Design a protein around this ligand. Structure first.
Ligand code: CLA
Ligand code: CLA
Ligand code: CLA
Ligand code: CLA
Ligand code: CLA
Ligand code: CLA
Ligand code: CLA
Ligand code: CLA
Ligand code: CLA
Ligand SMILES: CC1=C(/C=C/C(C)=C/C=C/C(C)=C\C=C\C=C(C)\C=C\C=C(C)\C=C\C2=C(C)CCCC2(C)C)C(C)(C)CCC1
Ligand code: SF4
Lengths: 95, 80, 153, 42, 100, 141, 67, 33
């Protein structure tokens, strides 16, 4: 009996003694409109497969990153501009 | 988990057991000393490794002897 | 003239160092009245500096290109006074100390609790033992020959 | 005085007396023979 | 009520406890078995809650220790005022307290 | 001896602390100590704070064995009462742990066997070269 | 016959794993039981790292010093 | 396009390959046969 006066070791009800409560888990039904839910369930199902999502994210993020860096003109980031200045000589002539 | 092996130089003073905070050790009957008892170690799986047993062993070097080994959640002193 | 070093009484950089330090002291001497006590202390320091440089001149010190007395510790007799005549004077005194503190430790080794004489030194016993180490080298020599210098475990 | 000579026999009191005497000795020597870098007396 | 509440001559002034070192405890008032004895002597030197387990003796000890600290602070102040008297330029500083 | 068969006895009066059973009880073993206190009194429990154990039987569930045995030694040395604690896995199977023979482990009860016991001095252990490329170590021959 | 040294005999230690190895000690007592493995109780002048001055030693882990 | 090759490989070794290796080695770290 877990609900007795200061008894917290009901052995068959070991979820209440171990602290297996869902402190905020609501079992209340779906709050969203079912048509919006159906839209998201059909349009996000392609991303559900995890072995096909990890591969997709890898080969899509790397693709977009190696692409947007390649076709980045010399206005976004200055490393692709160049010196844009006469190169100055180093110490001792150049050495 | 750990390996608390004891040796026959034990004199039966019962100080390692009285220092042990996990009941690893327990005195058994024996015939090798004036006190006629020796300190076994059945509950080695409960050993944290604190070596209070061998910081209380009044031998020339040691009789109880903690050899640190595979660390489990009981041996890593974990309340979580 | 060993190790490519001119002597210090002949080194121009040594005299230049002397003159530089003396001018540095005199520039601090101008701010005080000539009869005042800081001025007299500065003048005493000036004579101390002058006779220090003169003594490093006369004692055979060798000065380098930087113009500072270098010590030739190799063994040349001309410079034994730089290292060996002090060095023996160390090994004597040091060997006094160790021959005393060892002997004391042997004299309080046969007590009941000999540790309460380590922290509370028997001044009579220590004063009897202290001058035993005056001529310590013969005692250490003989104890090496008699085997009393090394414990036999 | 009994048990004061035992206190003055103790290692720190005796060490400060010995090193005060020794330091005064070295200090007065350096007053007498200042700025020494050689042993010229042979 | 708040009485005076003192007692006469609780501790005998003598150098007997100056002689035996580490008198103030059980495991130090035996003598040095090792050199850890001296570090434990100085470490537990003012640990009055370890020497005697009553607030009366502890409180007397810390009270007289505060008196010793006050004697030290007064001695240090005497030193500073004296070094300002005989070993100072205090007059010359008063005459020109911007370049002296 | 037969174990003591942990019942649903009451617990001490405690206002709650942040030293309880977080997740080592949900998925792993947690522990429980039972002591018979002759009177109701205050005691410093090992999870931080101060609880008031009741008269007669008390029961306190702790997260690891060291808490239980520390509290037990403080009870046996300060309040002189007889403690005995268990280990309860999250599926059940409460394991009797502390005395294991009814009498405390400092007493040489017969019946308990020699386990973890070498019949040699400590420096007669062979070197690691003797036990190299073998699953055994230098202290298990 | 009483086995081992005597209750005041001086002895030295041949135990490799001891603090007082190759160091002399004073035999306090020898347990006459022929079942105790380490009967020779020795007393040493200087403590070990555990601040202990005595340990029981075996008969073959000991050597009656000739002094 | 040879001054563009650093722009291809410095992200691909420094951002992409570290993500690949960290993910793969985190899976290898937590695997259980
Ligand atoms: C590093 C080894 C070494 C050692 C042990 C010694 C040892 C000694 N030297 Mg020295 N010496 C050394 C290197 C050394 N020397 C070198 C590299 C030089 C320069 C060439 C000298 C130059 C030197 C001189 C000029 C003299 C000594 C002398 C002496 C002896 C006094 C002493 C035995 C003196 C000697 O001969 O005493 C009899 C002496 O007059 N030495
Ligand atoms: C300013 C001068 C000065 C000062 C303050 C010191 C201070 C010191 N010296 Mg140094 N030293 C000096 C000049 C100086 N030295 C000179 C000029 C020489 C040339 C001779 C040496 C040669 C020298 C040696 C060779 C050694 C020291 C050592 C020491 C330390 C302990 C000495 C001692 O008496 O302890 C109290 C005394 C003892 C504990 C026993 C004395 C033991 C020494 C070695 C002398 C014994 C003499 C004996 C004949 C054997 C010689 C062996 C040698 C050739 C290796 C201390 C830090 C010792 C040290 O640092 O050890 C790590 C050390 O080994 N000194
Ligand atoms: C270990 C390194 C080392 C060495 C070798 C030296 C060496 C020296 N220092 Mg330096 N110094 C050092 C470390 C060192 N110092 C450190 C660490 C500091 C900072 C604390 C200083 C700070 C310092 C200052 C500020 C000064 C020195 C000075 C000196 C010189 C000492 C002159 C003197 O008073 O002795 C004279 C000799 C003695 C005091 C020994 C006397 C011993 C007694 C009287 C017994 C001898 C007689 C005995 C009975 C035997 C007789 C034989 C027989 C008849 C029985 C000398 C060149 C002084 C100097 O002149 O500058 C060069 C100086 O002003 N040093
Ligand atoms: C009102 C001030 C005050 C008072 C009355 C005390 C009183 C006490 N403290 Mg507390 N403490 C204080 C301030 C104070 N402390 C401060 C400011 C700190 C922070 C550093 C501490 C940190 C502290 C710790 C961490 C511990 C204590 C402990 C103790 C007790 C024993 C101390 C003892 O015996 O050492 C006697 C005195 C010494 C051993 C000398 C200390 C030497 C100092 C550290 C060196 C510095 C000196 C100087 C600045 C350096 C140059 C020196 C020169 C010669 C080269 C005693 C109850 C101990 C205790 O109760 O444990 C049971 C303890 O473990 N204190
Ligand atoms: C109005 C009276 C009065 C005054 C002035 C003080 C002042 C002081 N007390 Mg307090 N004290 C008082 C009443 C007073 N007490 C009472 C009634 C009690 C009992 C409840 C205590 C119990 C008490 C304790 C337990 C301790 C103090 C301590 C201190 C000193 C703290 C250090 C400080 O601030 O240095 C500032 C320093 C000075 C102002 C220099 C002091 C110089 C004069 C001569 C002494 C002050 C007058 C004093 C009460 C003595 C009266 C005459 C005497 C002959 C009877 C300080 C001097 C602490 C201390 O330092 O220990 C010594 C301490 O441990 N007092
Ligand atoms: C000369 C007079 C005298 C005499 C014979 C005694 C004798 C005694 N006192 Mg008392 N005492 C005195 C003056 C005296 N006291 C004074 C003036 C004070 C006020 C501070 C006290 C306060 C006092 C207390 C609170 C206690 C004693 C205790 C004792 C006993 C132990 C003494 C001991 O081992 O400590 C010897 C210690 C020393 C000699 C150290 C001196 C420390 C001084 C005060 C401070 C110096 C600090 C220094 C400036 C800073 C360090 C600098 C350095 C790094 C260079 C003994 C019966 C103890 C006792 O009986 O209780 C069990 C105790 O608890 N005394
Ligand atoms: C503010 C500095 C100060 C003060 C007031 C004290 C005060 C005291 N010390 Mg402490 N002490 C200090 C600094 C200080 N100590 C320091 C820096 C050390 C080194 C770590 C110690 C180490 C020390 C030891 C080891 C002992 C004391 C003891 C004592 C007591 C004896 C006083 C006595 O008899 O002296 C009267 C003497 C004079 C006035 C003249 C001394 C010259 C007293 C409580 C003793 C104690 O507490 O015993 C219970 C003791 O055994 N002191
Ligand atoms: C915090 C306290 C304190 C400190 C750190 C100093 C520190 C100093 N004093 Mg001062 N002094 C003090 C208190 C203090 N004094 C008090 C209370 C008095 C009154 C008695 C004096 C009276 C005094 C005089 C008359 C002289 C000093 C001198 C000195 C210096 C050398 C002392 C020396 O080597 O003694 C020697 C070592 C022992 C006695 C040990 C040094 C800067 C001297 C100085 O500045 O010379 C220019 C000097 O002539 N002091
Ligand atoms: C261990 C040897 C080594 C090291 C430390 C580097 C280091 C570097 N290389 Mg180089 N590289 C190497 C071998 C090495 N390379 C080899 C063997 C090849 C021929 C396949 C290349 C071909 C190469 C290219 C084409 C590029 C780099 C680039 C780079 C930089 C960013 C990392 C990326 O590279 C990718 C790594 C590889 C292709 C190596 C696979 C094996 C970095 C400075 C980039 C650069 O220039 O940045 C400024 C770049 O674009 N590397
Ligand atoms: C001359 C010279 C030199 C060189 C030298 C050499 C090289 C040497 C070597 C040496 C050696 C190689 C040595 C060895 C030794 C060894 C040993 C082994 C010893 C021992 C000893 C002892 C043991 C002692 C002790 C003591 C004393 C007596 C005192 C104090 C105390 C005591 C006890 C510590 C030079 C160049 C620098 C410079 C010039 C001069
Ligand atoms: S190992 Fe230690 S506690 Fe156990 S019997 Fe030997 S001396 Fe006593």
């Amino acid at each position: 009996k877990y609900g007795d006066k200061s008894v917290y070791f009901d052995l068959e009800d070991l979820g209440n003694t171990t602290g297996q409560w869902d402190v905020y888990g609501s079992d209340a039904p779906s709050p969203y409109n079912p048509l919006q839910s159906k839209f998201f369930e059909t349009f996000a199902a392609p991303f559900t497969k995890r072995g096909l999502l990890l591969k997709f994210l890898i080969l899509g993020g790397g693709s977009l990153l190696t692409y947007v860096s390649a076709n980045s003109t010399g206005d976004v980031l200055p490393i692709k501009r160049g010196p844009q200045e006469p190169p100055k000589l180093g110490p001792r002539g150049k050495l | 988990s750990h390996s608390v092996k004891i040796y026959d130089t034990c004199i039966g003073c019962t100080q390692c057991v009285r220092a042990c905070p996990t009941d690893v050790l327990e005195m058994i009957p024996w015939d090798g000393c004036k006190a006629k008892q020796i300190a076994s170690a059945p509950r080695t799986e409960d050993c944290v490794g604190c070596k209070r047993c061998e910081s209380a062993c009044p031998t020339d070097f040691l009789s109880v002897r903690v050899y640190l080994w595979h660390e489990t959640t009981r041996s890593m002193g974990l309340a979580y | 003239d060993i190790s490519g070093l001119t002597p210090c009484k002949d080194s121009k950089q040594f005299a230049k160092r002397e003159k530089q330090q003396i001018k540095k002291l005199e520039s601090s001497l101008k701010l005080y009245a000539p009869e005042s006590a800081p001025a007299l202390a500065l003048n005493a320091q000036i004579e101390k500096t002058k006779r220090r440089f003169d003594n490093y001149g006369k004692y055979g010190l060798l000065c380098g290109s930087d113009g500072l007395p270098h010590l030739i510790v190799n063994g040349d007799q001309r410079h034994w006074g730089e290292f060996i005549t002090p060095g023996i004077l160390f090994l004597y005194i040091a060997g006094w100390i160790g021959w005393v503190g060892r002997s004391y430790l042997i004299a309080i080794s046969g007590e009941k609790k000999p540790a309460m004489k380590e922290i509370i030194i028997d001044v009579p016993l220590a004063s009897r033992i202290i001058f035993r180490g005056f001529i310590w080298p013969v005692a250490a020599y003989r104890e090496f020959l008699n085997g009393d210098l090394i414990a036999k475990d | 005085m009994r048990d004061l000579k035992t206190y003055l026999s103790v290692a720190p009191v005796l060490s400060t007396l010995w090193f005060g005497s020794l330091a005064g000795l070295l200090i007065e020597i350096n007053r007498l023979f200042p700025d020494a870098l050689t042993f010229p007396f042979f | 009520e708040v009485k005076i509440l003192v007692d006469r001559d609780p501790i005998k002034t003598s150098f007997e406890e100056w002689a035996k070192p580490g008198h103030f405890s059980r495991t130090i008032a035996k003598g040095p078995d090792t050199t850890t004895w001296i570090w434990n002597l100085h470490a537990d030197a003012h640990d009055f809650d370890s020497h005697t387990s009553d607030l009366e003796e502890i409180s007397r000890k810390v009270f007289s220790a505060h008196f010793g600290q006050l004697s030290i602070i007064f001695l240090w102040l005497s030193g500073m005022y004296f070094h300002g008297a005989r070993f100072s330029n205090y007059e010359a500083w008063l005459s020109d307290p911007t370049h002296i | 001896t037969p174990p003591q068969l942990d019942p649903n006895t009451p617990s001490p009066i405690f206002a709650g602390s942040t030293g309880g059973l977080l997740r080592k009880a949900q998925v792993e073993e947690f522990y429980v100590i039972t002591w018979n206190s002759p009177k109701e009194q205050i005691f410093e429990m090992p999870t931080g704070g101060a609880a008031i154990m009741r008269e007669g039987p008390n029961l306190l569930k702790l997260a690891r064995k060291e808490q239980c045995l520390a509290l037990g030694t403080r009870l046996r040395s300060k309040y002189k009462i007889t403690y005995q604690f268990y280990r309860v896995f999250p599926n059940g199977e409460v394991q009797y742990l502390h005395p294991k023979d009814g009498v405390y482990p400092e007493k040489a009860n017969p019946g308990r066997e020699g386990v973890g016991l070498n019949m040699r001095s400590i420096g007669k252990n062979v070197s690691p070269i003797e036990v190299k490329f073998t699953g055994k170590q230098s202290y298990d021959l | 016959p009483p086995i081992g040294p005597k209750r005041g005999s001086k002895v030295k230690i041949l135990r490799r794993e001891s603090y007082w190895f190759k160091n002399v000690g004073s035999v306090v007592a020898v347990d006459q039981d022929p079942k105790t493995r380490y009967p020779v109780v020795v007393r040493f002048a200087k403590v070990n790292y555990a601040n202990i001055s005595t340990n029981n030693y075996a008969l073959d882990e000991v050597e009656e010093v000739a002094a | 396009t040879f001054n563009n090759l650093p722009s291809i490989f410095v992200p691909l070794v420094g951002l992409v390959f570290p993500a690949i290796a960290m993910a793969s080695l985190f899976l290898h770290i937590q695997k259980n046969k």
